[PDB]
Amino acid sequence: ELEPFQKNFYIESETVSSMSEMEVEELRLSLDNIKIKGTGCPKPVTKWSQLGLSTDTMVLITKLHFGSLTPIQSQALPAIMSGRDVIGISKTGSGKTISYLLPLLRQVKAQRPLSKHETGPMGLILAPTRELALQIHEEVTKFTEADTSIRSVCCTGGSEMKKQITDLKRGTEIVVATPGRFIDILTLNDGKLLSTKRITFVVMDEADRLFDLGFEPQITQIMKTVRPDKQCVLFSATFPNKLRSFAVRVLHSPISITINSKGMVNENVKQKFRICHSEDEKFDNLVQLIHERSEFFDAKAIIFVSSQNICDFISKKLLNAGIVTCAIHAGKPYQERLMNLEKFKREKNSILLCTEVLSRGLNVPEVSLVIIYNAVKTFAQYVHTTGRTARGSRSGTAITLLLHDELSGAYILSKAMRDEEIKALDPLQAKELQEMSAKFESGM
Ligand code: NI
């Protein structure tokens, strides 16, 4: 008859809870393309203060972690603090450790102390190597140092067992261990020196490595002696089939968090840009682009603009210059939208001229060329506009005509383009891009 306990310690800050869904999508794209799976994921935070940690802890952390929250921290901290099981896929050095330590500290702190007959622990962190266990435990101590109500003992192989037994004699709220040693300690002396009965929180870090180094049997047996309503988080740089299979076995309604696994834009889309200095130059490029394309002759294009007034203007402009377009926007009667869409889907080598906001929902097949005439200002809009050309192997090209003053636009391009896409273009255009993006970035 299990003892009930609290796992959700998260109070969403007002400023975060005010965020809309579109805002949250955008924040995830900007944070190195965070991808989530699972139901009910809390919104990412962007500041240590949105987590409701005491001043002590705040001072301590800062001290402990210098600079901005990492993408993994932004998303994993509120999900774990909320008591959810979590799969966190991110590289070593992404700061993942505090992502689980803070919530673990909080959870263990809240539980009643160990009785005079209870060994502990309440929290268990498993690592595949002695070197990682020691590193994790060093972190832990930087927090248990201030607070004498909480101990951690590090239990690994390649190290005296008797030494660690002397520790565990005194009871311990937290254990950091390699799987073999832990199992060895559990079974030792009728399992009377270490109990699993009070473990409510298990973390497995570098989880892919645990299978690599043959620990499936040990970690599987450990999870079998742990209450199944425990909170469990699995952190790993990769997600091999073995881990995927293990998570299904040990987790409930997990939230998976993957940081920039793949590119925000399909890698088969060829992203390009041209930096211009007047609307006129932008228009000169747009025309050169439309003619040039013909020498490579389905093959259709879509010019994206930012407003209905711009769409009308550019439509007339392009007309006066011998180029006929199928123009579309929400200020036009639906009947003529349909006429233009059908004309576009009908006529060979047609050109659609469309507002960026209608891009996600356009009912047309993928195209060979997207010309973004007004650099978009969000990551979400960039994905929807460029995605109009995405088509696995048959993906075409998306090109942005950017103006010298469009700093945020350059920030987006610098974050969504592949490095090798920026290399193949003129090194001065490239250099301006990076300068534009840096200026925007320090602008905040
Ligand atoms: Ni310039």
UniProtKB/Swiss-Prot annotation:
Residues of the Helicase ATP-binding domain: 77-257
GO biological process, one term: mRNA splicing, via spliceosome
Motif (DEAD box): 205-208
Keywords: ATP-binding, Coiled coil, Helicase, Hydrolase, mRNA processing, mRNA splicing, Nucleotide-binding, Nucleus
Subunit details: Interacts with the U2 snRNP and HSH155.
Purpose of the protein: ATP-dependent RNA helicase involved spliceosome assembly and in nuclear splicing. Catalyzes an ATP-dependent conformational change of U2 snRNP. Bridges U1 and U2 snRNPs and enables stable U2 snRNP association with intron RNA.
UniProt miscellaneous comment: Present with 358 molecules/cell in log phase SD medium.
Protein name: Pre-mRNA-processing ATP-dependent RNA helicase PRP5
Lineage summary: Eukaryota, Fungi, Dikarya, Ascomycota, Saccharomycotina
Protein encoded by which gene: PRP5
Full-sequence portion shown in this chain: 210 to 671 of 849
